[PDB]
Amino acid sequence: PTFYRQELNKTIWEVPERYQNLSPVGSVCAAFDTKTGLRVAVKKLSRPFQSIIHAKRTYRELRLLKHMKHENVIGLLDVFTPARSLEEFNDVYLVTHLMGADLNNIVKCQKLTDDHVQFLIYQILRGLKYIHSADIIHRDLKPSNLAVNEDCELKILDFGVATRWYRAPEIMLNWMHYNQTVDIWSVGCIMAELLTGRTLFPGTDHIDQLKLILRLVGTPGAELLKKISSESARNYIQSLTQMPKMNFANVFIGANPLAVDLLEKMLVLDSDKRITAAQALAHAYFAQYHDPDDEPVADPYDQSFESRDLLIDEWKSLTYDEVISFVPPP
Ligand SMILES: O=c1ncn2nc(Sc3ccc(F)cc3F)ccc2c1-c1c(Cl)cccc1Cl
Ligand SMILES: Fc1ccc(-c2c[nH]nc2-c2ccnc(F)c2)cc1
Ligand SMILES: Fc1ccc(-c2c[nH]nc2-c2ccnc(F)c2)cc1
């Protein structure tokens, strides 16, 4: 393809002629895809090979986006570099279907009915079942990572306001063996906020976050305490004033009881006891949307590179191969 060059907010964009009307939103632009007639979101990766971590991270983001082919997950329409060889290669651009806003754009100033909450959370979980089936934990699900178009159709972005608020208490405790239900926690927090119009846990730091989480869900019971390896975490938790799990009907008063029932299955304190994305999609709150024959699972995802300790030039070369081997969704 033929490329053109421009400057948008100090950043320099070199993209094929097919992409027109670049409009600022790595750095991100909205554009018009003349080949398909659709509006797209285009991401320029900043300093992709600045260091080993940046290089592995560049490779990681690209491998992820190439694998994700699900309606409620962000995937790739296109990948390109203006580089005409591996040695020249120092820029990665990723393009996807533009939705046009995020969930935080919607919630704000806005009251959503129970049917809208059903539709939205159904989609998040449907997307998560797919992600979790590829052995991927999102880890940072929040409103700003949920892209929503005007039909209220939703795509999860950015797997690999304040992030803190939607984060699982075991991540706040700094447990290194947290599981996928860390994402179910976030969805529970996201749902709560759509039903109520306020942040369920607006904490000022990691300590306050945990404190307000335990006020709703209670202090750990015996079963959970037995699983905490760290003496200091336990000293702390058990030195707080003990707290019962609050009645979720009292707290979320006026909400569809089916939505309150799902809420408390998602926000169970012990992560071993939290509902999975697949289980949640079968919950009666989504009877209107659910179709087991249309909640697909992902092909096997090779994350074995995660363990590997490579040179910058090695991650670069690998990323280069992945740019070149790209075949669009068509
Ligand atoms: O609608 C969107 N669709 C996609 N993205 N992607 C990205 S990042 C990105 C990731 C993978 C790509 F292939 C390309 C990328 F740009 C950032 C925003 C975004 C939006 C969006 C917009 Cl355009 C405005 C306000 C809020 C959001 Cl969430
Ligand atoms: F079928 C088509 C052909 C061209 C366009 C178009 C509209 N504005 N700019 C372009 C354009 C500019 C430079 N290179 C291109 F490939 C496209 C749209 C649809
Ligand atoms: F105050 C607390 C105590 C425990 C948790 C917790 C929730 N799910 N899993 C854990 C957990 C399991 C094993 N080791 C840990 F450190 C944490 C969260 C907050």
Three-state secondary-structure class, residue 11 = strand
293 is catalytic: no
Q: What amino acid is encoded at 110 in this protein? A: Q
Give the residue from 100, 119, 143 where a domain finishes: 100
91 and 195 both lie in a single domain: no
Nearest to 156 by CA among 189, 174, 131, 181: 131
Cα(49)–Cα(90) distance, integer angstroms = 7
Cα(125)–Cα(282) distance, integer angstroms = 10
Is residue 42 in contact with ligand 1, taking CB distance under 6 Å? yes
Mutate to test the pocket of ligand 1, among 40, 99, 150 (most ligand atoms within 8 A of CB): 99
Give the residue from 78, 100, 122 where a domain finishes: 100
Mutate to test the pocket of ligand 3, among 171, 175, 208, 274 (most ligand atoms within 8 A of CB): 175
Q: Is residue 1 part of a domain?
A: no
Q: Contact, 42 vs 19, CB < 8 A? A: yes
**Per the structure block, which two tokens stand in for 205?**
């730091």
DSSP helix, strand, coil percent of the chain (3-state; round to 5): 40, 15, 45
Give the number of the atom of ligand 2 that is nearest the alpha carbon of residue 17. 14
Q: What is the CA radius of gyration of the chain?
A: 21
275 and 257 both lie in a single domain: yes
Q: Is residue 322 part of a domain?
A: no
Strand partners, 14: 5
Alpha-carbon dihedral angle through residues 61, 67, 70, 74, given to the nearest 10 degrees = 20
85 and 160 both lie in a single domain: no
Cα(292)–Cα(311) distance, integer angstroms = 44
- Ligand 1 centroid–CA 323 distance in Å is 19
**Per the structure block, which two tokens stand in for 283?**
């919950």
- Ligand 2 centroid–CA 15 distance in Å is 13
Cα(280)–Cα(315) distance, integer angstroms = 38
Q: Is residue 220 part of a domain?
A: yes
How would DSSP label each residue in 252-301? TTTS-HHHHHHHHHHS-SSGGGSPPHHHHHTSGGGTTT--GGGS--PPP-
69 and 135 both lie in a single domain: no
Using the 8-state DSSP alphabet, how is residue 145 labeled? G
Catalytic entry in 91, 102, 114, 158? 158
CATH number at residue 230: 1.10.510.10
Buried b / exposed e along 192-207 (16+ C-beta atoms within 10 A): bbbbeeebbbebeeee
Cα(268)–Cα(219) distance, integer angstroms = 11
- Containing structural domain, residue 84: 13-100
Three-state SS string over 79-129 comes to EECCCCCCCCCCCCEEEEECCCCEHHHHHCCCCCCHHHHHHHHHHHHHHHH
Q: Contact, 237 vs 220, CB < 8 A? A: yes
Number of domains, the chain: 2
248 and 265 both lie in a single domain: yes
Q: Is residue 311 part of a domain?
A: no
117 and 253 both lie in a single domain: yes
Cα(10)–Cα(28) distance, integer angstroms = 13
181 and 276 both lie in a single domain: yes
203 and 215 both lie in a single domain: yes
Give the residue from 58, 83, 100 where a domain finishes: 100
Phi, psi dihedrals of residue 238, rounded to the nearest 5°: -75, -15
CA distances 325 to 42, 48, 85, 87, Å, are 19, 19, 14, 17
Q: Note the helical H segments in 133-172.
A: 169-172
Q: Contact, 74 vs 157, CB < 8 A? A: yes
72 and 217 both lie in a single domain: no
171 and 215 both lie in a single domain: yes
Q: Is residue 320 part of a domain?
A: no
Give the number of the atom of ligand 3 that is nearest the alpha carbon of residue 219. 1
Give the number of the atom of ligand 1 that is nearest the alpha carbon of residue 42. 16
Q: Contact, 50 vs 98, CB < 8 A? A: no
227 and 118 both lie in a single domain: yes
Q: Is residue 260 part of a domain?
A: yes
Q: Contact, 128 vs 187, CB < 8 A? A: yes
Q: Contact, 178 vs 223, CB < 8 A? A: no
Q: Is residue 330 part of a domain?
A: no
Using a CB cutoff of 8 Å and minimum separation of 24, what contacts does 276-280 make?
Answer: 276/129, 276/132, 276/180, 276/181, 276/184, 277/125, 277/126, 277/128, 277/129, 277/132, 277/180, 277/183, 277/184, 278/129, 280/125, 280/184, 280/187
CA distances 107 to 25, 144, 192, 259, 318, Å, are 19, 11, 11, 17, 40
57 and 176 both lie in a single domain: no
Cα(122)–Cα(289) distance, integer angstroms = 7
| Residue 28 marked ligand-binding | yes
